[PDB]
Amino acid sequence: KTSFGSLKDEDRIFTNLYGRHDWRLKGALRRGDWYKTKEILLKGPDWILGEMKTSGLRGRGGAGFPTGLKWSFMNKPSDGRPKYLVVNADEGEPGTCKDREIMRHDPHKLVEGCLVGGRAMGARAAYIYIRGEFYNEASNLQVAIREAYEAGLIGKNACGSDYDFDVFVVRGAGAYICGEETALIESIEGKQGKPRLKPPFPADVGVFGCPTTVANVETVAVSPTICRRGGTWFAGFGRERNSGTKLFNISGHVNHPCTVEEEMSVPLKELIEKHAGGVTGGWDNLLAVIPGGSSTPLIPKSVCETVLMDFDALVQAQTGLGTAAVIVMDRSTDIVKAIARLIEFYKHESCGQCTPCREGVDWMNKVMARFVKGDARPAEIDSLWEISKQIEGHTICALGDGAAWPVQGLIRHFRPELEDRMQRFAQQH
Amino acid sequence: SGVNNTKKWKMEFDTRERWENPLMGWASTADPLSNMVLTFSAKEDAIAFAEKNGWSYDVEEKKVPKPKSKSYGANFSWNKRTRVSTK
Amino acid sequence: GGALFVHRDTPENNPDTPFDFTPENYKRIEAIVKNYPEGHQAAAVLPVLDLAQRQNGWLPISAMNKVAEVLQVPPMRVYEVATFYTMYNRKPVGKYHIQVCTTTPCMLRDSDSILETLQRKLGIKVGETTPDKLFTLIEVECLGACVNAPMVQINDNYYEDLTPKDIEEIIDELKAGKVPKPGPRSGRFCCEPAGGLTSLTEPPKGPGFGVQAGL
Numbered sequence: 001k002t003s004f005g006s007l008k009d010e011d012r013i014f015t016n017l018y019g020r021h022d023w024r025l026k027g028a029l030r031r032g033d034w035y036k037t038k039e040i041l042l043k044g045p046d047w048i049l050g051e052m053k054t055s056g057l058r059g060r061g062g063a064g065f066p067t068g069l070k071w072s073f074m075n076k077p078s079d080g081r082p083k084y085l086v087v088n089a090d091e092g093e094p095g096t097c098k099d100r101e102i103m104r105h106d107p108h109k110l111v112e113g114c115l116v117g118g119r120a121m122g123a124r125a126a127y128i129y130i131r132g133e134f135y136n137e138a139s140n141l142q143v144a145i146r147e148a149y150e151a152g153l154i155g156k157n158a159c160g161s162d163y164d165f166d167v168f169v170v171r172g173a174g175a176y177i178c179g180e181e182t183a184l185i186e187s188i189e190g191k192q193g194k195p196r197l198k199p200p201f202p203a204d205v206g207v208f209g210c211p212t213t214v215a216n217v218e219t220v221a222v223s224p225t226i227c228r229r230g231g232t233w234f235a236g237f238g239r240e241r242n243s244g245t246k247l248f249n250i251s252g253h254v255n256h257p258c259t260v261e262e263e264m265s266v267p268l269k270e271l272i273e274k275h276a277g278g279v280t281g282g283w284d285n286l287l288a289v290i291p292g293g294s295s296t297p298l299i300p301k302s303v304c305e306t307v308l309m310d311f312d313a314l315v316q317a318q319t320g321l322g323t324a325a326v327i328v329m330d331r332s333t334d335i336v337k338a339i340a341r342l343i344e345f346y347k348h349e350s351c352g353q354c355t356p357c358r359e360g361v362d363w364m365n366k367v368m369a370r371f372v373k374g375d376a377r378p379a380e381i382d383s384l385w386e387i388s389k390q391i392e393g394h395t396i397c398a399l400g401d402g403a404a405w406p407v408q409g410l411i412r413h414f415r416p417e418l419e420d421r422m423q424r425f426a427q428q429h
Numbered sequence: 430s431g432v433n434n435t436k437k438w439k440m441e442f443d444t445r446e447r448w449e450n451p452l453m454g455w456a457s458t459a460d461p462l463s464n465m466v467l468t469f470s471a472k473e474d475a476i477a478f479a480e481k482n483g484w485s486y487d488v489e490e491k492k493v494p495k496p497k498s499k500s501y502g503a504n505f506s507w508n509k510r511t512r513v514s515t516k
Numbered sequence: 517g518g519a520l521f522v523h524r525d526t527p528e529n530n531p532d533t534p535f536d537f538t539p540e541n542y543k544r545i546e547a548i549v550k551n552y553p554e555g556h557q558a559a560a561v562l563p564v565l566d567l568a569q570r571q572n573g574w575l576p577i578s579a580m581n582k583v584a585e586v587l588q589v590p591p592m593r594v595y596e597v598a599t600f601y602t603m604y605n606r607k608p609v610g611k612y613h614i615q616v617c618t619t620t621p622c623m624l625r626d627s628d629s630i631l632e633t634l635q636r637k638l639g640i641k642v643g644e645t646t647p648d649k650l651f652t653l654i655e656v657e658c659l660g661a662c663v664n665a666p667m668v669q670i671n672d673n674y675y676e677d678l679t680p681k682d683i684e685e686i687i688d689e690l691k692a693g694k695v696p697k698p699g700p701r702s703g704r705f706c707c708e709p710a711g712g713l714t715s716l717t718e719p720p721k722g723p724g725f726g727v728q729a730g731l
């Protein structure tokens with residue numbers, strides 16, 4: 001009802017998050033994994049979707065979409081085409097390592113979630129597109145998959161259910177745009193990581209031109225624990241429309257950076273000081289914070305105090321949760337420089353098939369380098385705003401929104417810094 | 430790809446000789462109607478004008494493109510050849 | 517620039533350049549192709565190409581052409597992939613390719629110090645190789661190690677939460693024929709806090725715990 005801060009280990013869902021117990025099948029069974037999955041499967045798929053819905057579980061990929069409805073767009077009769085499930089593990093969003101931690105320290109949960117979601121959707125296999133820089137993680141994942149095939153939990157008779165299911169892993173060759181539902185699919189299919197438009201929707205025609213449902217590592221890894229303990233239990237955590245135990249990644253200008261699970265709608269200040277050791281110099285030295293990943297607008301110290309780290313509160317704070325990768329900056333930062341490096345990152349990682357991002361992101365990178373130097377005039381800030389707004393809702397994917405938003409945040413809270421840089425540059429001439 | 434000059438009917442005359450001028454090398458004509466072009470809203474209007482003025486005419490019907498089925502999903506198919514390799 | 521996206525033939529990189537897969541690589545390729553439906557085998561391009569890269573270290577044009585020939589694909593559909601993805605090396609690289617992350621989650625935590633210390637120890641620039649053809653330094657984006665920052669990636673291994681002294685150690689070791697231990701160079705083993713476990717220091721409950729009845 002209130003004070004959604006603390007969370008006991010009895011309720012933590014990623015138990016081996018710090019590599020303290022064996023990540024193989026022995027620790028998985030000893031910790032509560034691959035238990036009763038047979039009954040989970042012999043239960044109908046509609047029941048699994050009912051659980052996903054009554055849990056309030058919203059995807060963690062960066063957009064707040066409810067799974068149950070997402071995974072229910074796919075609970076249709078088959079038209080003689082194999083249905084699939086594609087797991088998104090290409091966490092290239094700056095500040096995000098939760099999926100790495102999962103992959104490498106508790107992969108049997110991910111595998112069990114693949115199987116559960118597959119029975120929910122009617123799938124035939126699970127394609128786990130994983131980043132290519134994560135070679136050791138993918139190897140651990142394949143080891144786990146081999147253990148599972150040997151134990152009989154996936155394959156011909158998955159746990160003794162009459163349901164046959166495979167799990168494939170796929171490396172990505174290092175691209176951030178391949179993290180989108182659609183460019184992911186194109187990569188798998190062999191083509192460039194160039195997203196496709198919607199419609200069509202992956203559920204109708206997706207990977208290999210077949211029905212498809214893309215989902216984040218955390219979502220699927222949670223699904224079996226929900227179906228096993230209960231969605232209402234998952235929904236007692238957090239606020240009404242946003243609920244669950246969410247992984248957090250606290251990076252930058254913080255003394256004890258870490259990854260953590262907590263109750264959503266938690267106060268950000270607590271989330272920092274209690275788990276981390278607080279910002280290096282003290283809350284007073286906090287210049288600004290990025291609540292989610294690089295694709296989320298900044299918010300300054302002023303509102304960072306009374307802000308709840310969930311979707312809706314961050315929206316009302318003119319920002320968003322995203323992947324919940326709290327990047328912290330103190331007063332010793334050229335914040336303009338950090339945002340300009342973010343824009344350079346988005347410039348490199350753009351695919352280049354739709355004009356707005358392709359051109360305007362490099363445009364904004366040049367303008368931002370100029371602002372760093374201060375060679376610009378303060379009449380160009382509104383030009384940059386207009387450029388951002390021309391990019392925002394006119395793209396095929398969100399990477400344009402992600403490149404436009406941090407600029408909007410910078411200009412919405414740190415315009416005087418830019419104007420002062422311009423004034424100093426004019427004096428220096 | 431503009432289709433705004435494919436709306437109004439035109440009237441054009443037969444082409445006649447054009448010979449270089451020896452002095453400069455320009456194109457000369459003894460054809461006053463070499464550049465006569467009239468614009469009509471329909472075919473019967475042009476036919477009437479031609480008949481009236483005493484000219485002989487050969488008409489050419491209007492070419493409208495045929496409506497075409499188009500789908501962005503066809504580019505992504507499981508079994509058909511519409512499957513494209515160039516995204 | 518350095519990433520030109522064009523290919524002008526040379527003696528080192530021409531179609532006649534001597535590439536070919538090993539009898540083991542061919543069976544790995546057969547398996548890969550088997551991981552996809554029977555009509556869709558042009559989806560193995562990325563794994564087969566990275567495999568060739570592993571065998572040869574880098575990717576010449578003959579490599580892409582042979583990948584195509586094997587998968588029966590147009591070679592341009594492979595040139596596009598190679599140019600698009602950055603993990604694919606189309607110029608020969610050093611024994612130990614060093615990819616330094618310089619995005620803000622790492623930059624904030626003094627990553628340019630590491631970039632410089634590597635510029636000096638090695639005697640190269642931000643995108644060059646060494647005369648010994650052993651080291652190759654480049655700047656790259658977030659590698660999913662934002663909490664254990666700074667960090668660098670050296671030939672499929674990470675080295676995290678490090679400092680000039682630590683990177684100097686790593687380089688002195690790679691120049692002696694050793695392969696160091698991937699992971700944070702500080703006390704912590706992974707993303708766990710440095711002070712101490714603040715989230716899960718209890719023991720885990722184990723099987724059948726929290727299970728709802730009627731399942």
Ligand SMILES: Cc1cc2nc3c(=O)[nH]c(=O)nc-3n(C[C@H](O)[C@H](O)[C@H](O)COP(=O)(O)O)c2cc1C
Pocket residue numbers: 058059060061062063065067070088089090091092093176177178179180181214215216217219397398399
């Ligand atoms: C440029 C870009 C990058 C993305 N990267 C990721 C990513 O790394 N991981 C992820 O889970 N979702 C990512 N997404 C979001 C995708 O839509 C994702 O496949 C989907 O939201 C996952 O479903 P879920 O959020 O319901 O779990 C990205 C989106 C865009 C536009």
Ligand code: SF4
Pocket residue numbers: 177195349350351352353354355357358395396397398399400
């Ligand atoms: S916004 Fe950028 S990354 Fe997204 S589809 Fe357009 S060009 Fe590609």
Ligand code: FES
Pocket residue numbers: 094095096617618619620621622623657658659660661662663665667
């Ligand atoms: S910003 Fe360097 S690993 Fe993420």
